[PDB]
């Protein structure tokens, strides 16, 4: 497990790669994979939908079981569930959605959940439909995460911009 290869080292504990996170998980077999989730743990698009489809909807049925007892998650909160065939554990983290007016300061609180796990395979948080600048999100990651995080970035153009600014 944790057979990470081909990653570019940005800091002493942050690594980056231009790759598909679902294909990486099947190749690395990580201990933890991170899901960019919403407060109701509905995996209907983005990274969440791709992970759930790779689990043949096993992630969605487990997520609904957790919501039935916990209710909605808080922005910046997280929960650890099973990783099914993709990893041992899946950490669902809810970043702030600046389109809904949620505070961008809460992105530090979202990344702080990574410090509960020794090594993670993760995407960037609060980007895309959550509306935060991906370069800003990566800045908050390298500033708050003290454990080993391996970042998969799908877009080649975005990948080159992040590398040019952080290496």
Q: List, as one string, the DSSP characters of 20-79.
A: -HHHHHHHH--SEEEEEE-TT----SHHHHHHHHHTTTHHHHHHHHHHHHH-SPPTT-EE
Instruction: Please tell me the distance from the alpha carbon of residue 7 to that of residue 117, in angstroms, as a whole number.
Output: 19
- Judged by DSSP in three states, 166 sits in helix
DSSP 86: T
Instruction: Please tell me the distance from the alpha carbon of residue 76 to that of residue 110, in angstroms, as a whole number.
Output: 4
CATH of residue 94? 3.40.220.10
Dihedral sign, Cα of residue 98, residue 101, residue 102, residue 107: positive
DSSP 30: -
Exposure b/e, 28-66, CB count within 10 A at least 16 = b: bbbbbbbbbbbeebebeebbbebbbebbeeebbebbeee
Instruction: Please tell me the distance from the alpha carbon of residue 117 to that of residue 136, in angstroms, as a whole number.
Output: 23
Closest CA to 139 of 113, 165, 106: 165
Q: For residue 37, give its domain range.
A: 1-167
Closest CA to 149 of 104, 105, 119, 117: 119
Cβ 26 vs Cβ 83: under 8 Å? no
**Total residues found in the chain within this entry:** 167
Domain count, the chain: 1
- Judged by DSSP in three states, 71 sits in coil
Distance of CA 87 to the CA centre of its chain: 13
Tokens 């790669």 sit on residue: 17
Tokens 């799908």 sit on residue: 154
Cβ 61 vs Cβ 35: under 8 Å? no
């Amino acid at each position: 497990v944790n057979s990470f290869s081909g990653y570019l080292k940005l800091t002493d504990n942050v690594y980056i790669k231009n790759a598909d996170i679902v294909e990486e998980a099947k190749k690395v077999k990580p201990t933890v994979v991170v899901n960019a989730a919403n407060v109701y743990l509905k995996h209907g698009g983005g990274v969440a939908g791709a992970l759930n489809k790779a689990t043949n909807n096993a992630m969605q049925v487990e997520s609904d079981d957790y919501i039935a007892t916990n209710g909605p998650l808080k922005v910046g909160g997280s929960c650890v569930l099973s990783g099914h065939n993709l990893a041992k554990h899946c950490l669902h983290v809810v970043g702030p959605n600046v389109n809904k007016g949620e505070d961008i300061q809460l992105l530090k609180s979202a990344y702080e959940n990574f410090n509960q796990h020794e090594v993670l395979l993760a995407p960037l948080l609060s980007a895309g439909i959550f509306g935060a600048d991906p370069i800003h999100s990566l800045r908050v990651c390298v500033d708050t995460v003290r454990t080993n995080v391996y970042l998969a970035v799908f877009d080649k153009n975005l990948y080159d911009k992040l590398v040019s600014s952080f290496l």
